[PDB]
Homo-oligomer: A and B are copies of this chain.
Amino acid sequence: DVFNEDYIKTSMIKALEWQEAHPIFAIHPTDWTNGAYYTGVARAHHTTKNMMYMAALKNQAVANNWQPYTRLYHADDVAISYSYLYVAENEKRRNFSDLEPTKKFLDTHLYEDNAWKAGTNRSKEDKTILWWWCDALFMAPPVINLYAKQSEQPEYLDEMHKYYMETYNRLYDKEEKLFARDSRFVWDGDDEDKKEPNGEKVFWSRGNGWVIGGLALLLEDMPEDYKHRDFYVNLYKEMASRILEIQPEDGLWRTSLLSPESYDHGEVSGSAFHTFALAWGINKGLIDKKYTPAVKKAWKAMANCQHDDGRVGWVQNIGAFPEPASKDSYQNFGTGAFLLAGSEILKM
């Protein structure tokens, strides 16, 4: 019974236990894959207050010495600080959490020059603004926002806004209400554009999941009266509206948003970010309650991809565009997304 509150809490614990027994990273335990994963752990804790989530969060923060990863120009490398900030706020204990290494990262990232800001890169991926790919909008903005809030330094939000607007102005497709992953996927309108197998624009489900899930985390903690809030609220509603509209019949979004018929089964990690962001918006009254059944159908479909031992399956491995997954494929960020969806499904 996938909608039963104890079912959902037990499924969430089992997903945590499975992933804790299978640690994984792309390049380091402090990298974006674990940052996204522990961000989901953090929200699962926020909803259930179960000590086991907080144990895992504290475990990893201590093991990593409260360090972000080390490419200071690189948004991916600060995603882990969300978990650090969350524990610092929610574990009231002196001589324990340390936010200095996060502060140091953010100061360099935001205020120091680097090759990406300088716009001197000449590659296909076009690495000529700080956040030149859409996934960055999950990795850095929610951390800068929670940092600004906890430290009472609103100026970080201004710097966040400047870079978020650059990404938005480059990659947000105003006609389709979805983000291209990077400049390669923006159309010039001719026979050399990158297209899906059915000829449509490429909009990657997890790619857009990062953005919309980043919006839900952002709006969760951004001040009510922040001077640019309306910009974020409206982007969130526009993207939510499209994602709802293109949700496949069986409830799971495919890895390709506009060419879902290219895949035989839906993909869990992008679907989990959408279900998180959607359930969040319904719970906050930003999205009409009549959308509850669509958000529940996704939840049901993802719940049925979870193995008896807790593994969250049907997750596409690391990438930058639509690719297949299978029933045993997993990743820590995919467990993280499932934990995010569950943490909001529980509040409906």
In angstroms, how far is the closest chain B Cβ from the Cβ of A9? 10
- What's the Cα separation between A24 and B52 when bound, in Å? 8
The B-contacting residues of A in range 1-47, CB under 8 angstroms, are 17, 20-29
In angstroms, how far is the closest chain B Cβ from the Cβ of A227? 40
Count contacts on A: residues with CB < 8 A to the other chain. 23
Query: What is the interface of chain A mostly: helix, strand, loop, or mixed?
Result: loop
- Known contacts A51-B317, A317-B51; is-contact A23 B96 (Cβ 8 Å): no
Which listed residue, B21, B51, B96, B323, touches A20 by the CB 8 Å rule? B21
In the assembled complex, A118 has its CB within 8 A of some CB on chain B: no
In angstroms, how far is the closest chain B Cβ from the Cβ of A326? 11
In angstroms, how far is the closest chain B Cβ from the Cβ of A95? 8
Q: Is the CB of B25 within 8 A of A58?
A: yes
Chain B residues whose CB sits within 8 angstroms of the CB of A28 once the complex forms: 62
Q: Is the CB of B96 within 8 A of A27?
A: yes
In the assembled complex, A124 has its CB within 8 A of some CB on chain B: no
In angstroms, how far is the closest chain B Cβ from the Cβ of A133? 18
Q: Is the CB of A24 within 8 A of B62?
A: no
Contact digits for A48-76, partner B, Cβ 8 Å, 1 yes 0 no: 00011001001100100000000000000
In the assembled complex, A93 has its CB within 8 A of some CB on chain B: yes
In angstroms, how far is the closest chain B Cβ from the Cβ of A335? 13
Q: Is the CB of B55 within 8 A of A23?
A: yes
The chain B residue with its CB closest to the CB of A96 is B27
The chain B residue with its CB closest to the CB of A59 is B23
Which listed residue, B21, B25, B27, touches A21 by the CB 8 Å rule? B21
The chain B residue with its CB closest to the CB of A318 is B51
- What's the Cα separation between A216 and B58 when bound, in Å? 33
Contact digits for A305-320, partner B, Cβ 8 Å, 1 yes 0 no: 0000000000001000
Q: Is the CB of B59 within 8 A of A93?
A: no
Chain B residues whose CB sits within 8 angstroms of the CB of A24 once the complex forms: 51, 55, 58-59
Q: Is the CB of A17 within 8 A of B25?
A: no
Q: Can you give 21 A-B contacts (C-beta < 8 A)?
A: A17-B21, A17-B22, A20-B22, A21-B21, A22-B52, A22-B55, A23-B55, A23-B59, A24-B51, A24-B58, A24-B59, A25-B58, A25-B59, A26-B93, A27-B93, A27-B95, A27-B96, A28-B62, A51-B317, A51-B323, A51-B329
Top 10 nearest A-B pairs (CB, nearest first) are A24-B55, A23-B59, A27-B96, A21-B21, A27-B93, A28-B62, A22-B55, A22-B52, A51-B317, A17-B21
